[PDB]
Amino acid sequence: QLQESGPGVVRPSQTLSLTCAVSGDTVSSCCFFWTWIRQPPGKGLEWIGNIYSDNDNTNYNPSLKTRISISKDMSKNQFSLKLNSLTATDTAIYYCARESPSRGNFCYAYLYGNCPLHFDLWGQGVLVTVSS
Amino acid sequence: TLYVTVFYGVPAWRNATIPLFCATKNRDTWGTTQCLPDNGDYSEMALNVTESFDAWNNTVTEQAIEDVWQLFETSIKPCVKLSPLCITMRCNKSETDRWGLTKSITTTASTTSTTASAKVDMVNETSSCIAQDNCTGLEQEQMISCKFNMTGLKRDKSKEYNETWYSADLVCEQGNNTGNESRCYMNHCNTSVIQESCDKHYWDAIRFRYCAPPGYALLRCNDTNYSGFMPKCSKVVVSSCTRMMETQTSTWFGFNGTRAENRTYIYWHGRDNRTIISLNKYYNLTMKCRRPGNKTVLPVTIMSGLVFHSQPINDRPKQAWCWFGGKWKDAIKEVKQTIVKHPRYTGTNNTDKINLTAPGGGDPEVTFMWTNCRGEFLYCKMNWFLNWVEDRNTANQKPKEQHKRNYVPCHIRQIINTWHKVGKNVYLPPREGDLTCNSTVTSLIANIDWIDGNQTNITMSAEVAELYRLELGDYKLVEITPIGLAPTSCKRY
Amino acid sequence: NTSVIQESCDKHYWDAIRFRYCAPPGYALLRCNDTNYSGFMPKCSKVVVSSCT
Amino acid sequence: GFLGFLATAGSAMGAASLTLTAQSRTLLAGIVQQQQQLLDVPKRQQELLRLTVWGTKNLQTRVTAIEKYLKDQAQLNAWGCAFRQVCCTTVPWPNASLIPKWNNETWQEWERKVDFLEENITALLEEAQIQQEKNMYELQKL
Amino acid sequence: GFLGFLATAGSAMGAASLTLTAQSRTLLAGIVQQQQQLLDVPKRQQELLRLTVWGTKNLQTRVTAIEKYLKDQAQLNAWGCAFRQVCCTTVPWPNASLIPKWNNETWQEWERKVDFLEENITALLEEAQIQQEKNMYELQKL
Amino acid sequence: GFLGFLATAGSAMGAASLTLTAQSRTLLAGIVQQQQQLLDVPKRQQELLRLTVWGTKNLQTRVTAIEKYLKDQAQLNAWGCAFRQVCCTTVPWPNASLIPKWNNETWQEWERKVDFLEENITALLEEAQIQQEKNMYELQKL
Amino acid sequence: DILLTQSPSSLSGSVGDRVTITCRASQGINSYLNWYQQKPGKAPKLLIYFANRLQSGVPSRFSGSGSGTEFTLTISSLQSEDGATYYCQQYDTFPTFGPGTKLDIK
Ligand SMILES: *[C@@H]1O[C@H](CO)[C@@H](O[C@@H]2O[C@H](CO)[C@@H](O[C@@H]3O[C@H](CO[C@H]4O[C@H](CO[C@H]5O[C@H](CO)[C@@H](O)[C@H](O)[C@@H]5O)[C@@H](O)[C@H](O[C@H]5O[C@H](CO)[C@@H](O)[C@H](O)[C@@H]5O[C@H]5O[C@H](CO)[C@@H](O)[C@H](O)[C@@H]5O)[C@@H]4O)[C@@H](O)[C@H](O[C@H]4O[C@H](CO)[C@@H](O)[C@H](O)[C@@H]4O)[C@@H]3O)[C@H](O)[C@H]2NC(C)=O)[C@H](O)[C@H]1NC(C)=O
Ligand SMILES: *[C@@H]1O[C@H](CO)[C@@H](O[C@@H]2O[C@H](CO)[C@@H](O[C@@H]3O[C@H](CO[C@H]4O[C@H](CO[C@H]5O[C@H](CO)[C@@H](O)[C@H](O)[C@@H]5O)[C@@H](O)[C@H](O[C@H]5O[C@H](CO)[C@@H](O)[C@H](O)[C@@H]5O[C@H]5O[C@H](CO)[C@@H](O)[C@H](O)[C@@H]5O)[C@@H]4O)[C@@H](O)[C@H](O[C@H]4O[C@H](CO)[C@@H](O)[C@H](O)[C@@H]4O)[C@@H]3O)[C@H](O)[C@H]2NC(C)=O)[C@H](O)[C@H]1NC(C)=O
Ligand SMILES: *[C@@H]1O[C@H](CO)[C@@H](O[C@@H]2O[C@H](CO)[C@@H](O[C@@H]3O[C@H](CO[C@H]4O[C@H](CO)[C@@H](O)[C@H](O)[C@@H]4O)[C@@H](O)[C@H](O[C@H]4O[C@H](CO)[C@@H](O)[C@H](O)[C@@H]4O[C@H]4O[C@H](CO)[C@@H](O)[C@H](O)[C@@H]4O[C@H]4O[C@H](CO)[C@@H](O)[C@H](O)[C@@H]4O)[C@@H]3O)[C@H](O)[C@H]2NC(C)=O)[C@H](O)[C@H]1NC(C)=O
Ligand SMILES: *[C@@H]1O[C@H](CO)[C@@H](O[C@@H]2O[C@H](CO)[C@@H](O[C@@H]3O[C@H](CO[C@H]4O[C@H](CO)[C@@H](O)[C@H](O)[C@@H]4O)[C@@H](O)[C@H](O[C@H]4O[C@H](CO)[C@@H](O)[C@H](O)[C@@H]4O)[C@@H]3O)[C@H](O)[C@H]2NC(C)=O)[C@H](O)[C@H]1NC(C)=O
Ligand SMILES: *[C@@H]1O[C@H](CO)[C@@H](O[C@@H]2O[C@H](CO)[C@@H](O[C@@H]3O[C@H](CO)[C@@H](O)[C@H](O)[C@@H]3O)[C@H](O)[C@H]2NC(C)=O)[C@H](O)[C@H]1NC(C)=O
Ligand SMILES: *[C@@H]1O[C@H](CO[C@@H]2O[C@@H](C)[C@@H](O)[C@@H](O)[C@@H]2O)[C@@H](O[C@@H]2O[C@H](CO)[C@@H](O)[C@H](O)[C@H]2NC(C)=O)[C@H](O)[C@H]1NC(C)=O
Ligand SMILES: *[C@@H]1O[C@H](CO)[C@@H](O[C@@H]2O[C@H](CO)[C@@H](O)[C@H](O)[C@H]2NC(C)=O)[C@H](O)[C@H]1NC(C)=O
Ligand SMILES: *[C@@H]1O[C@H](CO)[C@@H](O)[C@H](O)[C@H]1NC(C)=O
Ligand SMILES: *[C@@H]1O[C@H](CO)[C@@H](O)[C@H](O)[C@H]1NC(C)=O
Ligand SMILES: *[C@@H]1O[C@H](CO)[C@@H](O)[C@H](O)[C@H]1NC(C)=O
Ligand SMILES: *[C@@H]1O[C@H](CO)[C@@H](O)[C@H](O)[C@H]1NC(C)=O
Ligand SMILES: *[C@@H]1O[C@H](CO)[C@@H](O)[C@H](O)[C@H]1NC(C)=O
Ligand SMILES: *[C@@H]1O[C@H](CO)[C@@H](O)[C@H](O)[C@H]1NC(C)=O
Ligand SMILES: *[C@@H]1O[C@H](CO)[C@@H](O)[C@H](O)[C@H]1NC(C)=O
Ligand SMILES: *[C@@H]1O[C@H](CO)[C@@H](O)[C@H](O)[C@H]1NC(C)=O
Ligand SMILES: *[C@@H]1O[C@H](CO)[C@@H](O)[C@H](O)[C@H]1NC(C)=O
Ligand SMILES: *[C@@H]1O[C@H](CO)[C@@H](O)[C@H](O)[C@H]1NC(C)=O
Ligand SMILES: *[C@@H]1O[C@H](CO)[C@@H](O)[C@H](O)[C@H]1NC(C)=O
Ligand SMILES: *[C@@H]1O[C@H](CO)[C@@H](O)[C@H](O)[C@H]1NC(C)=O
Ligand SMILES: *[C@@H]1O[C@H](CO)[C@@H](O)[C@H](O)[C@H]1NC(C)=O
Ligand SMILES: *[C@@H]1O[C@H](CO)[C@@H](O)[C@H](O)[C@H]1NC(C)=O
């Protein structure tokens, strides 16, 4: 379903891009979010951001408020990241997920805190190194 | 080192469960008597706080429902009782037999007709069929002329009066009338006493808003994702008074709502599947109703000296009827789509399995929409409308119901059971002259009920009270409690 | 016939009714104490203060 | 409708407001508007003033608001901080286990974490005031 | 009652005896007379105490006596005066064109020339107190 | 409240036992219980809130508690000594024939022997507060 | 934000034993806690969601419960294939994830 992609090596102060394709489905399907997390080598998981499939609304981790941007393209069934001002600490495995809501009598809004939300579907992961 | 100390002037609050003050612009009767003037201040400010909101379990909505009802009761309370009228009335037999109140077996009717007869009939403003009150399929009103003996203040003197009743307002005694003058009584007299709603109730609009008393404030959700029940609302707006509420009481379709926005919202009860679907104002949905004919009204002084308004029409007018305008087909398609995409819906896939439907049973209070036009309640059979807006393949609905039209037949009823949970029967005085009303349509009152991934059934409901939770609902009342406690080192001496 | 007549049964007018008015706290009554008071007087020079009429 | 308290609700405990005069302003706006209507009702309706339920609901609403205003003033008088901002009482905080983050938490968040302490604290603050009061009595007598 | 407020009328702006305490005692007089009458009515009429127009008029004056008292204390608190003989302020007088003649004009004459300013001044006095509260809060943080 | 305030009765006038917090806590306990009932009644009876004798009576008892609180606080503010125990007013005691036995007589016995002095004293105490405050005005001008 | 922590950070047991992991929070989470199972070299997969429901496709030996500030993951019988890093996720707000714990095999 989720296939990520992008440069393995990027330089400091450049912008990293990563594009994930959806296979057998689209990015406009109702009630899904296209999200990204990071996993720096030797570390746990960090959520970085979310774009909602039925709208142009996004939700980002405040630590990257001025560094992260997420967009979608329905003609490609793709979604992507742009991460600016790269540094050494941005080396990580970047992963995609669909974050399907559990629709039903426990979901009131597609918002954090108002619907069961979980990453049922995960991609493969792309390891990106920031280096000279 | 760390002492409790007292922090006064703290920006904090808790849930309040107190009465609110009402304020209005219409001060002709109940406004001057009960309400503050509307200050005109509709400003609001936003806070960076998170709060829990619930339309159904609310004090704001609870007061709206009980206050509208209570002001009704105190308005009718002093009006003339009609128990002196619960006497045998002498009614024209052909009319009581024709409209089914009484029986006859000498009519031996038999009809032969074309079965391939379903038609499609559209009407709009630029048409003579509306101006002349005669559209294909409209029939006569069904009014029955009855005579009776009534006594005024002279007591030992009395007069006979000419009263024409709508057929649904009579019971009529049955069996072995081989002549004329059938014997009838009012439909709801014997189990109770019918009181006349004499103080112009429902002849105009009732609009008011609520204001918090000192020390209290109202919080409101300003999200687009508010669905009636929301445990964590991120956009919380503060105000001292609510938006203006229209206390309109109609079934199936709500009229003249204040929450008219360029969006379809569906509120959902947290513990149930009863919903209030707003309609998208983008489509200018409107319902224009007419009551044909020129009425005469004759005040009668009865026993106590109070006056009753009789209806000596002595004519045979066309049925009251209603015309639906605006882009109904598209507004309904959006509703179906909104349901499919809604967070609480886990039903079907396509909008071709989602249909509007009437509630079942033989009970007129749910099977027919009730609309209040300036004092006269108008029940309307809507199969023609539904067939049209849904573009249904009718086929087997039986010949009179198989048509697609943007108008429906309707029938006036003067003895109406109160909309609230009272059970009281009241009489609505007739309006003099002809009647016309042009309403906006802002909401649909319905349950969503599916048990599988095919067939969604949006079932129209008659709980008029649910409409007040769309008018308000998003408000929470809170108490400001500006005293805090917190460890600090700064004790006196 | 045009109305209902009610009996004035509770001894009304069978004796005299006399009363005076008193201002509530924070209010006072001013009175003209002239001989030239003719019902309407823009500038009354003798103004007398009391709590009750 | 000054809304001065709610205005700083989204900031932090160690950040803003601690306003006293806003309660007076709120009460004044309330009283004036109720008085204007009470003077207005008799212009059209003098008989049905308390006789019917709408007038009892408006009365209960007004009485409750007056009691609330005075309730806070009475509690402050017991503590002495009618006009003291932080007051500076001498009662120790119940335990070191429950401490505010002055730069992260708001007063709304904080107060909902000490609701089970207030039950004991109000009484303790009053007891402390009583002993201080006794000490002041003797000092004044001397 | 006493009406000391009128007794000193006509004495000029450079007035003597501004009987501040007069409002507290007028409240007390109000409460006593109305309470005694309400206790007296039940001797003959126990039901229709508020349910007949005389009792809606008498309740209105009782509730109002409480509210009038509180409006003045609340306004005074809003302007920073727990007790106000003069309770000096930080708000400047609007202009030099409106200055009283302390040894010629009376308070009745004077006040009726400045009703215009009272509407603008009330707000200014409240604003001054808001800033003073903010300043105290900053001092508390320091 | 618990009415522990009167527990000392019989102890003699000079046996300390005076307090400024007892009435606030009695009133505060009262307000919470009474407000809870005002809001509880509508769960069964929403129309007849003050349309009945008991409705009117509950109004009367809630109001009486408030009027009483205000009468006493208003009188103290007139004397200025809201928080001062003994208050230290400057009005001389009327005569040497009415002197308490601090270690024999109780406050109940004592107060019933000076009811006629309060009638002249209240006014004197109020004037003393006015004179002190007008002198402060003159000093601020200087 | 909500600080989500986990304990033991590293635990082991034999195949066939009973294994549990506890997650704790600095703030209450109503029930919105997810568990993920990540094996080395692979993306994490959802194991349990909304603190109570097993994700379809996950073996029945996995279960869990929790509320407020305390949640538990249980493997009724540890398998030789269950060595993995288990992570907790709160999604009450701006999801942050906990540090993760490791299950080894003995
Ligand atoms: C200020 O005002 C606001 C707004 O009014 C107040 O907010 C409201 O506060 C209420 C009181 O706390 C909340 O209601 C209560 O919610 C509890 C939690 O519900 C969830 O969990 C239930 C079971 O889960 C258990 O196990 C998990 C393990 O993870 C624990 O975490 C849980 O805590 C439990 O121990 C689950 O069943 C619930 O789902 C059902 O109810 C919700 C309601 O929103 C529906 O949406 C669901 O579809 C579902 O409904 C079905 O089942 C119920 C029966 O349970 C039927 O009635 C329905 O018709 C339908 O078939 C949630 O997922 C509940 O445990 C709690 O119930 C107990 O207590 C009540 C008495 O109050 C008893 O009657 C019950 O029988 C039971 O013992 C109760 O429902 C509101 O949700 C909350 N509203 C919002 C918008 O946030 C705020 O508190 C006020 N503040 C103050 C100071 O006054
Ligand atoms: C506290 O309570 C007290 C006690 O009630 C209050 O005192 C009263 O306050 C009222 C309101 O201000 C005063 O009435 C007003 O008087 C105005 C002035 O009237 C005189 O001048 C008129 C025209 O002259 C113009 O040109 C000259 C040039 O020199 C100017 O100086 C003037 O100012 C004008 O610009 C003239 O027509 C008047 O004469 C008529 O009225 C008097 C009333 O006393 C009669 O005595 C006369 O006989 C004559 O009456 C005839 O004409 C009138 C119609 O005008 C008919 O109704 C009569 O039946 C009859 O035929 C004066 O010489 C008026 O201009 C003003 O009217 C305007 O405003 C009202 C609305 O308020 C409109 O409805 C009008 O249509 C019009 O636009 C009004 O009458 C009272 O006199 C005063 N009473 C006392 C004893 O002093 C006090 O204010 C209260 N205070 C507070 C704070 O509330
Ligand atoms: C949804 O909302 C819409 C609005 O957005 C609602 O529809 C509106 O409802 C209004 C209230 O009923 C109605 O207003 C009435 O219109 C009447 C017709 O006016 C026509 O002529 C005038 C020019 O003179 C035009 O400007 C106008 O456009 C029309 O062409 C008026 O006659 C009505 O006036 C009466 O009420 C006002 C109240 O302020 C009085 O000031 C006025 O003097 C009139 O008083 C009569 O009625 C009162 C009742 O209290 C009597 O006490 C009084 O003595 C008068 O009674 C005599 O006359 C009446 C006949 O009117 C007769 O029956 C009686 O026996 C006496 O002889 C008033 O202005 C809007 O027109 C209407 N608009 C539309 C488009 O429908 C809609 O209902 C809402 N929907 C739902 C479901 O609730
Ligand atoms: C007030 O409310 C009204 C609705 O009541 C809003 O009007 C709608 O606005 C939207 C957004 O512009 C319109 O949606 C667009 O319609 C285009 C035409 O589609 C035709 O063909 C499809 C079949 O393919 C039919 O289903 C459809 O009915 C039409 O016949 C589409 O080409 C657009 O596609 C783009 O967006 C979608 C995502 O939604 C992507 O998947 C596509 O790839 C592409 O990028 C789009 O769907 C809608 O038609 C309008 N309705 C009406 C009745 O006019 C107003 O905008 C709103 N006012 C304000 C101020 O917000
Ligand atoms: C509103 O109506 C819908 C549709 O009737 C309700 O959905 C239904 O809810 C019941 C109870 O949640 C479900 O039954 C049970 O589902 C659970 C989870 O799969 C299962 O473990 C039980 O064995 C049982 O089957 C039912 O499946 C579900 N139906 C559908 C098609 O969604 C909904 O709960 C109602 N909402 C409220 C708040 O009343
Ligand atoms: C009030 O009257 C209704 C109906 O009136 C009777 O039945 C009519 C058909 C007609 O013949 C009238 O003259 C009669 O007086 C009563 O409802 C009937 O109750 C019986 C007994 O339970 C039942 O078998 C019938 O089907 C009912 N008919 C209808 C139309 O509802 C009703 O009971 C009366 N209420 C009281 C208090 O007397
Ligand atoms: C409701 O709308 C109708 C139009 O559908 C209005 O009726 C017209 O009124 C004008 C006078 O203003 C007449 O000249 C037209 O002949 C009427 N049209 C028809 C079809 O009869 C009506 O006035 C509007 N509202 C109300 C309350 O009557
Ligand atoms: C409420 O939301 C609308 C946008 O839908 C915005 O224009 C308005 O300013 C918001 N209100 C407040 C008080 O922020
Ligand atoms: C509303 O919520 C309260 C808890 O705050 C609960 O006690 C009450 O029963 C609920 N009412 C309804 C109608 O669900
Ligand atoms: C009823 O109207 C008819 C005319 O249609 C008239 O002949 C008859 O006398 C009237 N009856 C009464 C009771 O007014
Ligand atoms: C009608 O007449 C028959 C006799 O022919 C009798 O049995 C029946 O009871 C009568 N019905 C009524 C309603 O009078
Ligand atoms: C109709 O009523 C009249 C009395 O007004 C009567 O003479 C006549 O016979 C009745 N009609 C029938 C069919 O019985
Ligand atoms: C609240 O949000 C606004 C943006 O809408 C921002 O400018 C303001 O600084 C925020 N306030 C706080 C206390 O976070
Ligand atoms: C001690 O701290 C815990 C945790 O905050 C709290 O629940 C408890 O009430 C506190 N005990 C006392 C005496 O304050
Ligand atoms: C607020 O949180 C940060 C971590 O994000 C921490 O470093 C800081 O000490 C906290 N502030 C307080 C008052 O505890
Ligand atoms: C009032 O008039 C009297 C004379 O009748 C005079 O003695 C007194 O000083 C005057 N008082 C004032 C304030 O003008
Ligand atoms: C300035 O003085 C004039 C009188 O000459 C007065 O009308 C005006 O209101 C005054 N303006 C202010 C701000 O005090
Ligand atoms: C009072 O008026 C006199 C003229 O009669 C004048 O000399 C004196 O200065 C005025 N007093 C004040 C304070 O302006
Ligand atoms: C009060 O302030 C407004 C500006 O907000 C000004 O237009 C008005 O003239 C002022 N009033 C007075 C008496 O100066
Ligand atoms: C009241 O009498 C008891 C003995 O029964 C004694 O202990 C107590 O001190 C006395 N109280 C006072 C105020 O004297
Ligand atoms: C002087 O003392 C006696 C003692 O009984 C008392 O009656 C009288 O009122 C006192 N005189 C005053 C207060 O002037």
Side-chain angles (χ1 to χ4, degrees), chain E residues 21 24-25 35 62 69 83, chain F residues 53 60 67 74-75 77 126:
Chain E
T21 61
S24 294
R25 69 196 183 203
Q35 181 62 18
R62 186 176 68 181
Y69 174 80
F83 181 96
Chain F
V53 172
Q60 182 62 47
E67 287 171 342
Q75 189 65 66
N77 288 343
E126 290 176 358

Side-chain angles (χ1 to χ4, degrees), chain F residues 8-11:
Chain F
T8 195
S11 68

Side-chain angles (χ1 to χ4, degrees), chain F residues 18-80 82-138:
Chain F
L18 301 178
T19 181
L20 275 59
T21 63
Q23 291 71 35
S24 293
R25 67 186 183 186
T26 300
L27 181 61
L28 291 166
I31 291 168
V32 172
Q33 291 180 47
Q34 298 312 316
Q35 290 181 354
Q36 290 169 343
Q37 190 60 39
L38 286 168
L39 302 178
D40 189 69
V41 171
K43 74 188 186 187
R44 295 292 180 272
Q45 178 60 248
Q46 295 181 8
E47 184 177 71
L48 300 177
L49 299 174
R50 304 290 193 199
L51 273 52
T52 67
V53 172
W54 61 264
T56 299
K57 186 179 288 186
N58 287 341
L59 176 64
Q60 182 62 47
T61 56
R62 275 74 179 263
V63 172
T64 297
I66 296 301
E67 287 171 342
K68 178 171 168 54
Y69 177 77
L70 293 173
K71 288 194 286 182
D72 289 338
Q73 291 295 306
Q75 189 65 66
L76 292 171
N77 288 343
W79 297 341
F83 302 101
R84 293 175 61 81
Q85 298 298 325
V86 76
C87 302
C88 299
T89 60
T90 61
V91 175
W93 185 253
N95 63 355
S97 296
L98 299 169
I99 304 297
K101 296 179 175 70
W102 289 102
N103 60 335
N104 295 77
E105 293 178 308
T106 64
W107 280 103
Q108 181 64 32
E109 290 166 317
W110 173 251
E111 288 298 321
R112 297 286 78 77
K113 294 182 181 182
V114 294
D115 283 337
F116 58 87
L117 298 180
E118 186 172 1
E119 290 178 350
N120 280 48
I121 291 170
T122 298
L124 292 170
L125 293 171
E126 290 176 358
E127 187 65 25
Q129 184 63 21
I130 293 167
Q131 292 292 318
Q132 290 168 33
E133 293 291 314
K134 62 94 176 169
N135 287 336
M136 291 306 298
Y137 174 65
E138 289 293 319

Side-chain angles (χ1 to χ4, degrees), chain B residues 102-116:
Chain B
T102 61
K103 301 293 185 180
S104 176
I105 61 169
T106 62
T107 63
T108 63
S110 178
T111 299
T112 299
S113 67
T114 299
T115 61

Side-chain angles (χ1 to χ4, degrees), chain B residues 67 107 156 174 282 488:
Chain B
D67 289 343
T107 63
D156 62 7
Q174 299 182 345
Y282 181 75
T488 184

